[PDB]
Amino acid sequence: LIGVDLTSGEDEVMLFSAEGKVVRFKESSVRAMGCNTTGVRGIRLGEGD
DNA sequence: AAAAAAAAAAAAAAAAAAAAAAAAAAAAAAAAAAAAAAAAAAAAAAAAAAAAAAAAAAAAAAAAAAAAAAAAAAAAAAAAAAAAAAAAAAAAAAAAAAAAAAAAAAAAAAAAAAAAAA
């Protein structure tokens, strides 16, 4: 499913919150400007559940 | 031959419908822009991979915000009565293929008629 969707601008740092006690931060500018009906880019090597 | 029902006479009661003409709106059906979606090419950011590293969980231990106990008091929510909204179950139906009865064309042949020959 889709975890959550927020509307953001360039150079705004985004954080994740795993349900197995994890939190990460990657500048949003690192990742390429995606398009519709495409695949996805990995973010977090979240092992297990 | 008995019963029953239609129809027609004439003064009464009471209804219904088709078109023309112009100008505006409202349904309802089409081409045609316009953008999702999908197939098939090259192309390029991410995982891999490896070495190298140093930032946050352990551990000692005080102490300061805490969650249970006690009490008083306010009053949200739950279950029982009624009263509405909204959806499957079941039954019905109007066109619609199937069948049966009557109108128009057909010629074979003859009765009666009209006409003319010698």
Q: Which of residues 1-30 of A touch strand B (CB under 7 A)?
A: none
* End-to-end alpha carbon distance in chain A: 14
Q: Is A30 helix (H, G, I), strand (E, B) or coil?
A: helix
Experimental method used, please? cryo-EM
Q: Resolution limit in angstroms? A: 3.0
Closest nucleotide to A30 by C1' from CA: B45
CA–CA distance, A16 with A45 (Å, rounded to integer) = 12
Query: Which residue do the tokens 């360039």 mark?
Result: A10
CA distances A9 to A12, A13, A28, A33, Å, are 6, 9, 9, 11
